[PDB]
Design a protein around this ligand. Structure first.
Ligand code: UVO
Lengths: 300, 237
């Protein structure tokens, strides 16, 4: 189990750690989060009590370094930093645990939710979508735009998701216009899976990361990317059977985790109705269709 | 975006543009089978691709053999239209290629956009306007060449005959839509009006009769009467 200590909490803030969250009051004696499960990426995220504008946070993997949080009163945010001095850090952490100034990552033992949301997400792939090579952790916020969004403006603060565009020369083979537009299998299997992602695990990893950024930060370009990646699979007549079964599991846990009150803004009516009821894979997503129909029958 | 009631004189500026109407590409007759089921038989069709400024009509004849062994023909027809329009554009010299193509039916947008990916600077536009081009097959010479075709064929016409010698494009298009609107509402009466006077003939190289300026005003007024008549016969007014 790993620990992310906090130097202090000088401003009142709601802190998230993965799908959990808690409120910290202005200058409350809070010194971090302990008992963080090893083996998964994690995200620690923030929403200030006095300006809910800009949810922001940090993706990290405790196996890659010792990380802590420190408020910067000049830039006005909680910043993740890495401590290279391992003994300084163990020293800091041990003192804060002895004084019981830390919240415990509150994982129920039955619960596989976080694993199921991050199964294919790798820190190495996050760091290629979020480019800031001097840090081992990645900052994301509500306002960051995607490469695709910028094409339609600061490139250093962009989310470099894989561009997917159904009416593009990449998506459409000369001479197979109708075939390729109505059945996206070429674009999914040859262009994206074989060509760009290399394998379905990397594809699902980016799909999962896009969802989590949409959910945790309200990042609109991330929600667009998540829906495009779902639509590309559902709009393909030929999909490896293992991918369809895994996609059903992935989407099920994403829909299960979504706050009931954010479904109006995080779920695209067209994509979901098309995917569950009109597409080639209309009959291949049983678990996702069941939870969607019981939880969000309005959208449909 | 869409060409509507507010932005149509753009039809007659000097940016090359084409209307594309696909309503006569896939044509069928429905009939009973010996077993009392229903079946269709395709007949030859055509793409109606028109420069409204010059009157140049690129009539691509769609021979029934293009449907042989194909499924979902109404969907295929839109993609075949887009394939042929794209082929036409590529066949034209660069300085003759359109800047815009306006499709009369919105279902042509995605097929044409996808076929024209190589031409990102050609704008593909819908129109809220209700243009009467489905009635093109009521023009005897166009119907004749479509039905006589035994293979795919492109035939070029000027749908304005020599009108542009005497009137503007604006007025010429105006006349064409009125003629076609009349043929669409009551083809029999429309053709009666156009040929009632055997002394006015259609030149071998023309589609419409050789009306004087004054006779065109009469004709035009008779076509408006006919359209209003049918509007009353229809709605009882
Ligand atoms: C002279 O231009 C036009 C353009 C559209 C028309 N009807 O939709 C029309 O009759 C005349």
């Amino acid at each position: 189990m790993n620990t992310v200590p906090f130097t202090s909490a000088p401003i009142e803030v709601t802190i998230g750690i993965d799908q959990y969250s808690f409120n910290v009051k202005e200058n409350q004696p809070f010194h971090g989060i302990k008992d963080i499960p090893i083996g998964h990426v994690h995200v620690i995220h923030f929403q200030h009590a006095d300006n809910s504008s800009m949810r922001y946070g940090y993706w990290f993997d405790c196996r890659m370094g010792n990380f802590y949080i420190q408020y910067d009163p000049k830039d006005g945010l909680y910043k993740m930093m890495e401590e290279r001095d391992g003994a300084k850090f163990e020293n800091i952490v041990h003192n804060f645990k002895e004084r019981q100034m830390m919240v415990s990552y509150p994982k129920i033992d039955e619960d596989d939710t976080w694993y199921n949301l991050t199964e294919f997400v790798q820190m190495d792939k996050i760091r290629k979508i979020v480019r800031k090579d001097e840090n081992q952790f990645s900052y994301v916020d509500s306002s960051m735009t995607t490469v695709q969004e910028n094409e339609l403006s600061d490139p250093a603060h962009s989310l470099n998701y894989t561009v997917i565009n159904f009416k593009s020369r990449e998506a459409i083979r000369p001479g197979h216009e109708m075939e390729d537009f109505l059945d996206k299998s070429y674009y999914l299997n040859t262009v994206m899976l074989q060509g760009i992602f290399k394998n379905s695990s990397n594809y699902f990893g980016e799909l999962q990361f896009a969802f989590l950024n949409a959910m945790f930060f309200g990042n609109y370009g991330s929600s667009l990317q998540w829906h495009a990646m779902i639509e590309l699979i559902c709009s393909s007549a030929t999909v490896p059977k293992h991918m369809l079964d895994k996609l059903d599991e992935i989407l099920y846990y994403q829909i299960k985790t979504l706050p009931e009150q954010y479904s109006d803004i995080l779920l695209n009516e067209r994509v979901w109705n098309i995917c569950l009821y009109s597409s080639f894979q209309k009959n291949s997503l049983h678990n996702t269709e069941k939870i969607m129909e019981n939880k969000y029958p309005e959208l449909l | 975006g869409a060409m509507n009631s507010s932005n149509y004189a753009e039809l007659f500026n000097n940016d090359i543009k084409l209307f594309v109407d696909d309503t006569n590409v896939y044509r069928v007759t429905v009939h009973k089978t010996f077993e009392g089921n229903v079946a269709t038989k395709a007949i030859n069709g055509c793409i109606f691709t028109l420069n409204p400024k010059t009157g140049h009509l690129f009539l691509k004849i769609i021979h029934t053999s293009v449907w042989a062994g194909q499924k979902r023909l109404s969907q295929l027809a839109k993609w075949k239209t887009a394939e042929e329009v794209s082929a036409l554009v590529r066949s034209l010299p660069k300085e003759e290629q359109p800047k815009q193509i306006i499709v009369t039916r919105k279902a042509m947008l995605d097929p044409l956009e996808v076929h024209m990916l190589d031409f990102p600077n050609i704008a593909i536009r819908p129109t809220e306007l209700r243009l009467p081009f489905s009635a093109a097959m009521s023009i005897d010479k166009l119907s004749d060449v479509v039905m006589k075709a035994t293979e795919p064929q492109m035939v070029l016409f000027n749908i304005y005959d020599d009108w542009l010698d005497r009137i503007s494009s604006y007025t010429a298009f105006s006349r064409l839509t009125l003629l076609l609107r009349a043929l669409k509402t009551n083809e029999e009466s429309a053709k009666m009006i156009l040929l009632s006077d055997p002394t006015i003939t259609i030149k071998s190289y023309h589609l419409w009769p050789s009306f004087t300026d004054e006779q065109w005003i009469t004709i035009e007024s008779q076509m408006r009467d006919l359209i209003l008549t049918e509007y009353g016969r229809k709605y009882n007014v």
